[PDB]
Structures are given as structure tokens and as C-alpha cells.
Design a protein around this ligand. Sequence first.
Ligand code: NAD
Ligand code: NAD
Ligand code: NAD
Ligand code: NAD
Ligand code: NOS
Ligand code: NOS
Ligand code: NOS
Ligand code: NOS
Ligand code: NA
Ligand code: NA
Ligand code: NA
Ligand code: NA
Lengths: 429, 429, 429, 429
Amino acid sequence: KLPYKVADIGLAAWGRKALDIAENEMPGLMRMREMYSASKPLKGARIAGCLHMTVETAVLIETLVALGAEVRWSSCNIFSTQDHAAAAIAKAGIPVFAWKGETDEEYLWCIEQTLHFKDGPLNMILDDGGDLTNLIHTKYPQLLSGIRGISEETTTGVHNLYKMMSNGILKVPAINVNDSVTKSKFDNLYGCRESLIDGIKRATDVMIAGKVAVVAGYGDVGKGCAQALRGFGARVIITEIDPINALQAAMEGYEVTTMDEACKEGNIFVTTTGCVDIILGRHFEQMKDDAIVCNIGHFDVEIDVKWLNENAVEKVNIKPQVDRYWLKNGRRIILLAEGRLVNLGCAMGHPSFVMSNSFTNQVMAQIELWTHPDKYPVGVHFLPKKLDEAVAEAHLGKLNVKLTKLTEKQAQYLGMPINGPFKPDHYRY
Amino acid sequence: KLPYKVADIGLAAWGRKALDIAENEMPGLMRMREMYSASKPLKGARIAGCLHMTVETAVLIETLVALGAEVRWSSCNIFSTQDHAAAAIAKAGIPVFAWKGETDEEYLWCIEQTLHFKDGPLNMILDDGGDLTNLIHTKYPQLLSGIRGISEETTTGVHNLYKMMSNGILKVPAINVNDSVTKSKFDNLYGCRESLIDGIKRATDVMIAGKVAVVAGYGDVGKGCAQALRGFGARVIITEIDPINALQAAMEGYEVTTMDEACKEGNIFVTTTGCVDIILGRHFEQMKDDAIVCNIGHFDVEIDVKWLNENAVEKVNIKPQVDRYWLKNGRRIILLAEGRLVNLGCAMGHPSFVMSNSFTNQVMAQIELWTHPDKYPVGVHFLPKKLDEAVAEAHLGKLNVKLTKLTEKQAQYLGMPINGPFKPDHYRY
Amino acid sequence: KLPYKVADIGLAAWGRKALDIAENEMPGLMRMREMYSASKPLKGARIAGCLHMTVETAVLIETLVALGAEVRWSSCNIFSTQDHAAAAIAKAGIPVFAWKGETDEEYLWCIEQTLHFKDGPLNMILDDGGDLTNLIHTKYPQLLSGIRGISEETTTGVHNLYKMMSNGILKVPAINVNDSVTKSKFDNLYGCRESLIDGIKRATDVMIAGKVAVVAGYGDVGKGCAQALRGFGARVIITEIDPINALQAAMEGYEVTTMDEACKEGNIFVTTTGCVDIILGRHFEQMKDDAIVCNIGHFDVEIDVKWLNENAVEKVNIKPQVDRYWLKNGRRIILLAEGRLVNLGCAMGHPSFVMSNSFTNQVMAQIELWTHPDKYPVGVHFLPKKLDEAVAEAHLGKLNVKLTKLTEKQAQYLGMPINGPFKPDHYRY
Amino acid sequence: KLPYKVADIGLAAWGRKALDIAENEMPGLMRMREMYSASKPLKGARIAGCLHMTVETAVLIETLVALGAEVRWSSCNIFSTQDHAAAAIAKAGIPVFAWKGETDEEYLWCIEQTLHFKDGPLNMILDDGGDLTNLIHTKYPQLLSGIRGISEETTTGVHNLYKMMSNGILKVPAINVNDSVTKSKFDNLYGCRESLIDGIKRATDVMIAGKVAVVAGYGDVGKGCAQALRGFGARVIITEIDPINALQAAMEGYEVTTMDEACKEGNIFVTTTGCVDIILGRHFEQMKDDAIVCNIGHFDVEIDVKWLNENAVEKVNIKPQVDRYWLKNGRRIILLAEGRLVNLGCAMGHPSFVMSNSFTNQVMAQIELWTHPDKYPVGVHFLPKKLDEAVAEAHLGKLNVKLTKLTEKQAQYLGMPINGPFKPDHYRY
Ligand SMILES: NC(=O)c1ccc[n+]([C@@H]2O[C@H](COP(=O)([O-])OP(=O)(O)OC[C@H]3O[C@@H](n4cnc5c(N)ncnc54)[C@H](O)[C@@H]3O)[C@@H](O)[C@H]2O)c1
Ligand SMILES: NC(=O)c1ccc[n+]([C@@H]2O[C@H](COP(=O)([O-])OP(=O)(O)OC[C@H]3O[C@@H](n4cnc5c(N)ncnc54)[C@H](O)[C@@H]3O)[C@@H](O)[C@H]2O)c1
Ligand SMILES: NC(=O)c1ccc[n+]([C@@H]2O[C@H](COP(=O)([O-])OP(=O)(O)OC[C@H]3O[C@@H](n4cnc5c(N)ncnc54)[C@H](O)[C@@H]3O)[C@@H](O)[C@H]2O)c1
Ligand SMILES: NC(=O)c1ccc[n+]([C@@H]2O[C@H](COP(=O)([O-])OP(=O)(O)OC[C@H]3O[C@@H](n4cnc5c(N)ncnc54)[C@H](O)[C@@H]3O)[C@@H](O)[C@H]2O)c1
Ligand SMILES: O=c1[nH]cnc2c1ncn2[C@@H]1O[C@H](CO)[C@@H](O)[C@H]1O
Ligand SMILES: O=c1[nH]cnc2c1ncn2[C@@H]1O[C@H](CO)[C@@H](O)[C@H]1O
Ligand SMILES: O=c1[nH]cnc2c1ncn2[C@@H]1O[C@H](CO)[C@@H](O)[C@H]1O
Ligand SMILES: O=c1[nH]cnc2c1ncn2[C@@H]1O[C@H](CO)[C@@H](O)[C@H]1O
Ligand code: NA
Ligand code: NA
Ligand code: NA
Ligand code: NA
């Protein structure tokens, strides 16, 4: 029935001011507007969005609409919504169901309000984390035959997509947006490099300099976190299950040990694994007084937050999403955002510039699926490298980067199109 | 007349939460309390405090008090007070006069409230920037001979103490706390390394990576700001007048040029000079669209905000302390905190750990002035190197540092006492 | 006829001392010895090697032999051979045809002496740069039917392999060793990070701090070079044809412009493109006095060295592989190793630890091709990821890295073998 | 008696090549020549020089000479002389006594040759480490009153000048050149940042990346060595006695602990303390296999080489200045340069650019002492800040730095002369 549902529509004006500033920071999305506003390649699309409802996401949403699509939106995390952002989208006349600090039930509710449009069920999915994807496959399968495609933002979501596919249970063609190079090596890496510390700082205002910081996982996210921490004068310790990642981290000058060891040394703990059971009771019990513990992976499964609730003598809320626990042993643990995504949970997520790479990849994927479905049979697909290169290209102007153009002789020497793609498929950048 | 004036005494319970956390990050101040809470060296002291009313200052104030002093407090900047810290201090029955967003009229009023104690006038000054010092020399000279001592926090205020002495204005002994090693080369350096980005990020959420950031000045504050922005992937340009500082910046891989040049290139501008007329009209008319401009030196004379107010077509307020000016060239300038301290004005200032160095120096200074008048004629003095080292030593344990101890044979060889000082008076660290 | 041909067999003892020290640095190669010395998986193999004849290569050579193979060796660069290393191999009784400062004819000669063994023609190729591969395909095709496989070390060599294959002209199955992750993200990246500056320093002893350094190309090699230069206080400028690489470099805080621009600013120039025509006459003529110019890509085609020889007023040899040119314009250019590989040309190549990753990959490839030819039809192949992970694993012990082992529950959550591989094929690390 | 003594006068033509190059990296020294070659301020000076006989010193010597001085030279370390630099200086008709690999007997002989000029005894000392100073005070006191001045290069020698004064031993005015800002905080810092790794690499070709490097001391030399090893991916542990330096290292993300602890962890050991008994038997018996041990502080008392010589089962010489000791535990220690200066002993010392700062200070000191005796009583003096800044200014242009110029209004505001000094005497930079 409702046109939207947000925390306070009164925050619309401020949101709009924030949207204005962010647009000017997001040239990938803006170029998409220049190119495709007239031709409206998305007319007919009915896109249900499940993705952190922030200022950046607002710019993506309004890009989808300018491209002719109908869009309904919900956040993919109970803490991540930026209320002023949601307000602006709602006031603009776009159905959005999102607010900071939802309950687990308000969460599923919001998502369901994205499923039905004036003209019928949804026919495109833009998902971050697999939640909207899974909800349709298991709760509303009858809607699967009317969906042309899914595009998936984050590494956990795509992981799930692969597992669905190899189990025969995926029924809609899916583009893996996470593993666009202009996503995974930008958003995951440099985004977290700037938003992790933001989140810790806003929550706790602790000094990084002189701390021991333990980062679990050294993939794209863990790389960015580690480097951000080291940059501020923290001594950074890494844990890893993958020998290749571990050698990388050792070659960069980090000590790489087990959580079972590092729990006794760290003052700050950051989980980036995307895997269950990373920081447990046995670890909490050995930590230094006032350890800070927070997770940055997509789901809050990495930290045993239940163990704290059940086993602490004392639990004091310092403020929204900041909890201080007193244990049997007389020491305290500070826990951030109840173990959910700390950058989005306790701050404002990645900054808008890098998000423009992510969101540009999303737009192209939506066009690709909507306009070229034949290209995309049931399964999980990458964007072509030429498009990947295009998104990066689109962001060079704003940083005043001058790109070298190959001469004809050069292109022939390298046996390469003068216009790219400039790399083979297996290139790792 | 008021027993205190704050924004909201209701914020006192949160404030106390914040204080409990802070104390645990501030072993220096705590060592001071466990050492002198019994003997009460500041028995009889009446300290008037003009210094940013933050959580960190709260802990400082309570240290003073537990050491027997009576204290009355105001903030030394109009935007830097933390309301919950102020409230927690007022709730504890300590007269404080401070809130975020005072007018210039209210600012002077607050400093005035600190002059008079039930038992007569102030006999001690603790100052950051020298406004309290100037006010009593300029406007209340009859109180001068009743004041035993001044301790001064910051580069600007300490510079002013030097000018006053050499002009025969200064009528009270002063201690130069800024130029303690454990202050200048820690709080100035590492403090700003963490709190500059925090201010920019909270205000604007801009991405540092890929930007050109121009840092005016490369003293202690400049070094820290530059390193911070470098660390996140900004390309940093420095301006300097001092050939030594200039050569230092160059040897660290920073381009050094003039504002005249650099204003055409920067996306972000931080002044750190302590000097007037750093960024002017001619710089502004040449800046890239949406250039972010802010100041981190003690007073707001570095950026010609006057020029923006008189010349802009339109000033749009974004949120407290964030303004977007539209210029006659069609470009926009984002100014933070009306050109006042960005870290304190837009974030939370330095974290508590580093403030513990500065504040421990502050406490020792008060003790030295009040307990040992005879040692300090009218002039500007440094704390002894012995105490300077003590401050450092007192933060070691919290970080799990194991300092080495000279053997007798080594001490003999180096010709120093086993227990310090370990460095000649001219040592630069 | 000859058993070997080296600069001076008298350098054998010193070489052996150097080999002893390096073994202890190369656990990948040593584990290969433990595992396979008894079973001799390479008995019957007749491996012709064309790869820089350094201490590290010596350890690989003796690993091949311990694994049962017959080996004959030549260097793949006229300047790269380490004479004491070649001496040790020769004195050990292994046919080696290698010495520092060969002529272009002595070079082809050496390579040809690797082709024939006591029992017949060669049947395995271990190549770095495609030279031995190409020589057989075009000069001695009659030997192609008796070769089981090729393994290729460097990015230029594999590029060529791909071009051969898609032109129908490759006739032997080839493993791409370069693009093992434990090669490309280690050897290319961290190797050059340490050997580029080594090479510049030994040649010229210049101060990096305060210089402008221009690095052409920002792939694996360019990444390592850039970071090494920046680490010493050089201001680093990057050129690139690939938008993705360019954005990476901009996001790390480097200025990215064209050579046409950078030629006027740089004091040091490093080419890492693997492409022709990077630094030309038009560039040389605009460079600062005493610019240093050197190449680190596989072939000496990147710098127009002919243009210098033809157009300089004056050419003075400072010492082996160090040339100083005086131009028409009165300024000087310093050119390193006549434009050939500077790390190997003017120093000692990558250090032995990282080379162990490279060489371990080589050994596995040789075993793979020799022992499992059916697995490898004509074409270009990667090592399986499980083997890639094995090489990294083999190096963890020596750095005292402790790797986390997945629990059963965890492995099931991630839907992954408890033992790896832990990453999908498209992962970029 | 000899007009000079060098290893080979035949190396003079290469040496001159090296000199031509060096001069171009040393604008400070050149400025000095273009300024004073006419007026000849050192007319009548007879400077005896004891300072590492390197290319850089050659340029220094020639500057002195062109300024009218007569000069006789010896090296201040047995392994640091560069034979071609020595030869080029001897060929130019300047008495020098210096070669790489002197015995202790030859070392003292060489210093002796510098005392007597055709016109009678030396009237000026230019010293690095204080051996020339000690020798004339201890053994030739009758020459004392004939000497006008001493200028002293290094921390150790300058420390000794302080001890001699405070013991009433020092009978000549001395200038403390080390503690020039443009010296200590450049040559000590950035010099070692480049020349430490060069020494290790030339000697051993070990990989820094992934190693644990232990750095004893964290003064200016320690800071530079630590940064260098960090930059290449070593994990660096610091030891310190000074709580200030210790806290600094901690705030930069380095673990700080004791040698007693750290000797069990390090792969590489650099002493920087200037102090005796840093690495002892108990450290050696606990080190990892093939630990590399070296010293970069001025004399060789930091590592107990005596212990290794008496206790090792077997010492294998590898090449000049590289020894591998076999221990009774079966492990090996690699000692560099018999525990003497590793950068100068195993490589080429600092590059010429930074030496130009130190040497320009050296020249100004000689000018000040010789031209203005009246200004300098017996004691230890600093150069004025004005000259300190001049040195810096003189290196700016070569780096294309544009220093800003205070307007009159700013200078008035800051209360300083437009042309400096820009900093109070206590400023630490
Ligand atoms: N804005 C954000 O907060 C943000 C950004 C992007 C991605 N993510 C999420 O972050 C997580 C990681 O993303 P990524 O791109 O770095 O993925 P990734 O695949 O690169 O994985 C990180 C690493 O975790 C390691 N790991 C797994 N289990 C481990 C264990 N038990 N102990 C230690 N290490 C372990 C793996 O070896 C892997 O290298 C995912 O959940 C992803 O969706 C969050
Ligand atoms: N938390 C904070 O915000 C904080 C912390 C410490 C001090 N400060 C303030 O920051 C300012 C700088 O402090 P500092 O301790 O680094 O002082 P400093 O003297 O070490 O550094 C200031 C530098 O600015 C340079 N400079 C002066 N005028 C200039 C001009 N016109 N253009 C370019 N460079 C110029 C000077 O050469 C000097 O090197 C002072 O006002 C100080 O009180 C703020
Ligand atoms: N020991 C060594 O010296 C050593 C080590 C490994 C590789 N190599 C050689 O180094 C070269 C590069 O290796 P890599 O692994 O970094 O390869 P890479 O494919 O990562 O390429 C480097 C980059 O060069 C860029 N490029 C190409 N033409 C250009 C041009 N005209 N201007 C600017 N940029 C241009 C490409 O965009 C690419 O990103 C190859 O020749 C390789 O064989 C040498
Ligand atoms: N080119 C070169 O090789 C070069 C350059 C400059 C100076 N030096 C020499 O290097 C040495 C260090 O020089 P600096 O200028 O850094 O002096 P510094 O006083 O700044 O640093 C020495 C540091 O060592 C610490 N220390 C002393 N004894 C120690 C111990 N037992 N354990 C741990 N730490 C200890 C001291 O606290 C001090 O901080 C001196 O001998 C100096 O002459 C060599
Ligand atoms: O500010 C933001 N707005 C929207 N999405 C964001 C922001 N910051 C990070 N992510 C996204 O969150 C995913 C994990 O769920 C990441 O993959 C990232 O793309
Ligand atoms: O969090 C804080 N609380 C209180 N004072 C602070 C904080 N951060 C920085 N300063 C102080 O502000 C002065 C400049 O006016 C600096 O000298 C610094 O010590
Ligand atoms: O010290 C070395 N010994 C042998 N090969 C080396 C060394 N350093 C680098 N390379 C190799 O040279 C290739 C380019 O021809 C690189 O790919 C690298 O693996
Ligand atoms: O290349 C060089 N030539 C000459 N002296 C040098 C060089 N590098 C460092 N030092 C000098 O050696 C002293 C320690 O004995 C240092 O003070 C430094 O200035
Ligand atoms: Na954001
Ligand atoms: Na704070
Ligand atoms: Na090597
Ligand atoms: Na040198």
C-alpha cells in the first residue's frame, strides 16, 4: 500500500544536499546518466534492490530511474541505512523501505515491500549479500520465471551464487559484480582502507598509534584494513588459512599467527574472513583489558556475540552500537555494532568516489541482463573486461590522470587491440 | 552567578561512560593520581582552565582536583567542547562553562566565569592558545600579582608567551608545555595524524585516495597531517617558508611548492602554519570544483573566510560546521568549521592516549609552578628532561614495551646515570 | 665437445660458498630435494636451460640434477651471468655455457651448446624470455617431436607463447610458470622491489630521497619498482596505457601522466612495460641534467639506446654497464646496462628467498611435463592451484608463519575442502 | 716521507669520473666554491682531515683546497676508503693516506702523516669520530696551541668532545657539526635509510621481505635503518634505553623489546647505539640459523666479535668483510665488516646528495673557526641557525623546490625577519 517507509521524511532536504555533493564525486554514475538518459535502456525493468541504503546507493538508485527503470529498495543490513539518504529517495518519489536499527522482522518486511510494482512482480534483482536472492528462491519460487537477472555486489553473496549453481538450485542468470576488477581491487581494498578506521573512530575514539591490531583474513578486505591500521602506527598481526595470502602478508612485514595466539596480544580485533567462528569465548577470555572487537565481513557470524551476552557479568551500552562487557576475569571487552559490519554500522560505509566504481559495475550489469538476456544463461557471469576497463576509464578524468595511448607499432608489438582490452583473462592486477 | 553552564547536564551519564573508557587509555594521568591523591600538592591552588572541553580534558580536570586543586573551566575554542564531557564535569560539582557552538560573545563570557573562586581570585592559569593569559594581562592586571604560574599547551600560545616576555608584558612565570618532547613530538605529530582525517571524514565523507591534498606548513602538525593523507593514498603537496622543513618534506617524497601554484591542483587544503593569510581570494578563484578547505592551526586566521562571505554568490549550509560556497566562476568551495580547528571542530580532537602525554606534562607543570615558586622567575621555562622522560616511561607499560636498562659498564662507557637523562639538552629526537 | 664454458673456473670455491648460503634461503627448492631425491622423478629428462645464470639458478640446476635429470645451461641475457655461480656449476660437473658480458654471437653459441646430450637431443625446455623456445621452433624444428614440454618463467616469454599458440605455430606443450600466483605476485612484485634499487645503487650510488622518479608501466614489476622508490623518499610518477592499472596507481597516491610530460620532470627513469619505444629521442632531449635511465623489462627495446649513440656529442664509459652521454643541448644522460635488465645487469637479480618461489614453480612444472605429459596437450597451461598453494606453504616455515587450519564446521560453512584449494580460479589475490 | 699513500694511483681516472658525477649531486659544496674560490677565506689554513676517504669526501677536500686551504687527509675507518676517490685526490697533488683494508697499525700511521705540512704543524682539525682529536691531545700536546679549531662530524666524536670539555681535557675550540639540523636530521636519518640496505645487500644479497629485523637503538641512525627495513617488508623490532625514543618507535607501529628477547626472533641485527656490549655471546647462542649481524654506529664495540672469534667452532671467510661463523650449536652467524660500519665497510656510505649537507656544514665550520677565532673560546659550539638554514636553502634548487616567501604582513604577524631564522633555538624539526 505504502509509497515508502523511512525513519523521518524531514531529513529529505539534508539528504538532498548530501546527494548533490556525492554526485560530483561519482563520475562513473554521472557518465551513465549522460550516455543513457535519452535512450532509457532500462524502460520496462522492475528492479528490486537490497543494498545498504546510504548516500551513495541513493545516487545509484536515481541513476537506475533516469535510465528508465522502476525501482523499489530495501537495505541489506539492519544498521547500515543512512536515514537522511533514505528520506531523499522517498521524497523524490521512489519507494524505499529502510531505516537505521531495524529488527530482524522489520528487515524481512522491508525486503518484501520491494517485490510488487504497479505493473506486476519484480523482474530484476540488484542484491548485496544474497538475501533478496535467497528469499525469492526459497520463499517465493513462483516469481522466478519472471525475473530476467540478478547482479551481486559482495564476495559473500557471489560465493553463495556459485554454491547455488553447482547444487542445481539457481534459477536466474547472475552477474558477479564483486569480481569485476574495478570492484574487488577497489571497493573491497581501498574502500575498507578508509571506512574501517572511520567506523572504529566514531564508535570509540581510540588511538591506533601504539596498538597491536589483529586482522583476521588477508584477502581484499583484510589487505585494506591491515594497511589502514599500520598507517596510523598500529602493529598489525594477521591470521590466515590460505598459504598464499599468508605469504603475501609476511612479505609486507606483518606477523602472521593464529587467533589462538593473537588473542593474548591484540588491543583491537577486526574480522574480514566472511567465515563463521573466528573470535570465540576462549579468545575473549584471554584478551587485554578494553580490547576493541568488531567485524567488517558481510554477515555477523564471525564473532561469538552470543557468548558475551551469556557469559559477561556486566553489559553496559555506551551508546548506539557500542557495548562494553565486564567478564568473570574482571577485564572488559568493547564490542562494535553487535558484531555486524562496522564501517557501515558505526560510520558511513565506503566514501562515494570508490563506490562509483562499484555502482557503475552494477548499472552495466543491470543493462547487460535487462538488454542482453540471451548473453546470460542460468549461471554466474563476469562483466567483460572491456566494460571493466570502461568503468576505470570513467574515473580517470576526475583525478586528472593522463592515460598513454598505444602507437600502432606498439599495439602490433604487444599483439593487442590498440583500444584494449589490454590484459588476458587470467590477469590479476 | 552560575555554578556552571553547559548545553545539557542530562548528557552526564554518557559523559561518565566516556570518561571511564578514557581513563583506561590515559595511564600517565592515572599514575599522577595514584601518586599524589594522598599528599595533595595542589592543596590551595585555584586553577583557571581555558582548554578544549573534551572527554580528555575531563580526565585532566579530575586529576587536578584529586591532587587538591580547585578548578574552574572554559573551552579555548567555540566549537570544540564535547557536551557530554562538559556535563560529566559539571555533574561532579566542578564549575565549567563550555558548549559546542558558542558565539564570540559567549566565549568571552565563559572565560570570565573562571576568574573568581569562593576564596578570592585565581592563583593559577592553565592555558591553550593564550586567551586566558592575554585576558588577565590586558583587562584584569590587578590579578596578575595574585597568580603564581601559567602553563601553556600549544605552539601558538607558547609563541605568544615568548613575544610577551621579550616585550616586557609577561608578569607571571610561565611553563612551555608545548615544547616538552613528550608533547610537541607526539600530540602535535601523532595526534593530528589521527584527528585530521577524522574531522574531514565526519564533515564530508570524502575519499582521500586519489586526491591531491595540499598541506600548508610542515612543522609538527604539518608532518602528521601529511603522513595521514599520504597513508590513505592522497598525493600530498607541501608549502613551507622554512628551508629546513622544506628540505625535510622533499626528502620524504613530497612535492614542495607555493600556494600560488598548488591552489590550481589540490582537492583538499589543510593549513598548519600558525600564520595569517595562507589561503586567499586568488587561491579560491582557481581551485577545482568542490575543493575542501580547512585549518588545523590554533586560531582561524589562516583561511580568508571573510573573502568567501563577501564574494560568494551563495553560501549553502550543509550541516553544523560544513558550508558549500557557490562562486562567481560557477565552482563550489566546501569550507569546514568556518576556518577553525577542524579536528576538534568537526570530530573529537586527539584520542585520549596521546592527550595523556600532554596532560601529564600539564599536571607536572602545575605542580612545579605551585609547589616550587622559587625555581621559576618571571619568564618562560621548560620542564626538566628528567620529568619529560618520566611522562614517556609512564605510557610504556600500557603498550607492553620493555625498555632496556643500561648495565653499569655501559652507563660508565656512555657517561650517563643509569636512570637518565639519556640525552643532551640540545637533543632533537 | 666442451664440458662447459665459463669466465674463470677459479671462482668455483667462492661460488660454492655463495650456493651454500643461498640453499639455506631457498626452502622450496630444498623441500623438492627431500621429497624427490630418492624417487628421481626426472630420470630420463634432458633439460636445456636458458635462464640468468646466477647463484639462485645454480640451486635450481642442482635441484633438477638431484631429481635425476640431465641438464645443460645457458644464460638468457648477455649481462646477467654471475661468473662465480657459473664456475660452481661447471666445477660440479654440469655443462654450463655462461659469462657476464657476452657478445650477441657468443650468446646464440652458448644456447646451442645446450641442445645435445650424451644420449641424444634435449627433450625438456626451461626457458626465461622465449629465446630457447623460439630458437628451436624456427632454427631447429626437426627437434620439436622429441621435446615433451616447455616451462616459461617471465611475462614476456609467456606472452609470446600465447601468440605462438593462437597463430598455430607452437608445437610443444608449455606451462606458464610466470602466472603462477606464487610467481607473478611474488617474484615480479617483491623481487623487483628489492633488486631495482640494488641495481641503480651499485651503478651510480645516487640518492633516491628528494628525486622525481618516473616508472613506466604499473603492472607487477612497476608496482614493486614504484613502491621501492617511494620508500626511499622519491616522488614517483607513473605512466600507463591500461586504465585499470592507472587507477590503481592514482589510488595509491602516485601522479599518473604521459612520458611526453614526465620526461621534463624525472631525475630517474625506469621502464617496466615489456613494450617497444617507451623512452625516445624527444624525451631524452627534455630531461634534467644527469637523468638516470634504465630498463627492467625482459628485453632491451624500451629505451632508444641507438638514438643516444647516434646523437650524443660525447659518450664516456664510467665503468662496466655505466654510460654517461653529453647531448647537443649541453646536458648529460646516465644510461644503465645499455638498456638491458638493470637489476640483473648491474646487480645480482632478485634475492634468493623470492627466487625459491619462482624456481619451485619451475621444478613442479618440469615434473608435471616430464611425468604427466598426457595432462598437457599442445598449448599453454597453468600449474593447478593446489600446487601453487604448495609452493607458498613450503616457504611459511622459514618465516615462522603459523597458518590457521579450518575446522570441519568452518570448511562446510565456506563449502570448501578443508585442505584447499581455498580460492576459486578467478581469484586475483 | 711519502707525498701520499693509496692502493693504486691508476684508479685515478675512474675516480675523476666518479667525482664529476658527484659534484653534480652536491650543489651546497659547489655554491661554496663559486662563492669563495676568489676571496680564499682559508688562505693560510692547514687542515688535517680524518674522515672516510670516499668520492663524497674527495669533493669536500677539493672545496677546502679551492678556498685556499692546504689539506692532508686520512680515513677514519679501516674499510671505508674508496680507492679510486683516494687516487683522484692524490693525482691532483693532495697528500692522502688511505686505502680499503688497512690494519690497525697502518690506520695510526696514516693519521700521523697528516700532522706536518711543509710550513710547519697543522693549525686545523676536521674530524669524524674524534681519533685525530684524541691523538693530538694524548700524544702530541705541544701542537695543541698551534691549532685554531676542530670541526667534528659524527655523534660519537661530538659526544667525546663534550666529555673532554667537561673533564678539562679539550684545549682547542670545537664546532659540533653533527648537531647542525641539516646534518643530524638528514645524513643520520636519510643517509642510513639508503646506505644500510646497500651494505647488507652488497655483502649478502639476502632478501629483506619477510624477515624479522632487530634494530638496537632508535636515535637518528636507528630511525633511518628501521624505516629502510620496514619499507622492504621486514618486520622490525627496536630496542631502546631512552623512554622517549622507545615511545616514538612504539607510536610508529614497531614492537619495542630487549635484545634478551629479540635475539631469539631476528634474522637481521643492526646496532645503532654508539654504545658497548649490545650483542653478546648469550644473544649469539640463541639466534636463528644464518642470522646476519652488523653495526652502523661509529666504532666497532657494539658486537662482541671477540666472543665469536674465541667461541665459534670454525670461521669461514666468504669474501672481504663477510664471515660465516659455525657455532657449537650447529647454527651459523654471518658477521659483516668484522663489526665495523656496515654502510661504509660493505658499500659506498651515504650517497653524495646528503653528504653535501654535512660537508657544507663542515666547510662553514672551518671558515667560522679559521676566519673568526675571536668568536669561539675553548669549548664546543654549534653553527648559528642562520647558516644552518643556508645549507638547506642551497640544496632546494637542485630538487626543484619552491620555498614560500613571507609577506611583510605575515612576518610582522609572526614577528620574524622575512629571511630567517624561522625557528626558536629550541626547535626540534
Ligand atoms: N563494506 C564492507 O564492509 C565490505 C566490503 C567488501 C566485502 N565485504 C565482505 O568482507 C568479507 C571478505 O571479503 P574479501 O573480498 O576480502 O574476501 P576474500 O575471499 O578475499 O577473503 C578474505 C580471506 O579470509 C580468509 N579466511 C577465511 N577463513 C578464515 C579463517 N577461519 N581464519 C582466517 N582467515 C580466514 C581467506 O583465506 C581469505 O583470503 C566478505 O564477507 C565480503 O562480503 C565487506
Ligand atoms: N590539535 C590541534 O589542532 C593542534 C595541535 C598542535 C598545535 N596546533 C596548532 O597548529 C599550528 C602549527 O603547529 P606546529 O606545532 O606544527 O608549529 P611549527 O612551528 O612546528 O610548524 C608551523 C610551520 O609553518 C610554517 N609556515 C609558517 N608560515 C607559513 C606560510 N605562510 N606558508 C607556509 N608555511 C608556513 C613554518 O615554517 C613552520 O615550519 C599552531 O597554531 C599550533 O598551535 C594544533
Ligand atoms: N627480474 C626482472 O628484471 C623482471 C622480473 C619479472 C618480469 N620482468 C619483465 O618485466 C616486464 C613487465 O612484467 P610485469 O609482470 O610487470 O608485466 P605486466 O603485464 O604486469 O605489465 C606492466 C604494464 O606495462 C603497461 N604498459 C604497456 N605498454 C605501455 C606503454 N607504452 N606505456 C606505459 N605503460 C605501458 C601495461 O599496461 C602493464 O600494466 C616484462 O618484460 C617481464 O618479462 C623482469
Ligand atoms: N654513516 C654512518 O654509519 C653513521 C651516521 C651517523 C652517525 N653514526 C653513528 O651511529 C651511532 C648512533 O648515532 P645517532 O646519531 O643515531 O645517535 P643517537 O644518540 O641519536 O642514537 C643512539 C640511540 O641509542 C640508544 N641506546 C644507547 N645505548 C643503548 C643500548 N644499550 N641498547 C639500546 N639502545 C641504546 C640511545 O638511547 C639513543 O637513543 C653513533 O655512533 C654515530 O656516530 C653512523
Ligand atoms: O557507503 C556504502 N554504500 C553502499 N554500499 C556500501 C557502502 N560501503 C560499502 N558498501 C558495500 O557493502 C558491501 C558489503 O555488504 C561491500 O561489498 C561494498 O560494496
Ligand atoms: O581531544 C582533545 N582534547 C583537548 N585538547 C586537545 C584535543 N586534541 C587536541 N587538543 C589540543 O588542542 C591544542 C590546540 O589548540 C593542541 O596544542 C592540543 O594539545
Ligand atoms: O637472481 C636471479 N636469478 C635468476 N633469475 C632471476 C633473478 N632475478 C630475477 N630473475 C628472473 O628474471 C626474469 C626476467 O628475465 C624474471 O621473471 C625473474 O624470475
Ligand atoms: O659516503 C660517505 N662518505 C663520507 N663520510 C660518510 C659517508 N657516509 C656516511 N659518512 C659519515 O660517516 C660518519 C660516521 O663515522 C657519519 O657522521 C657520516 O656523516
Ligand atoms: Na560514504
Ligand atoms: Na577524543
Ligand atoms: Na641474488
Ligand atoms: Na656514495
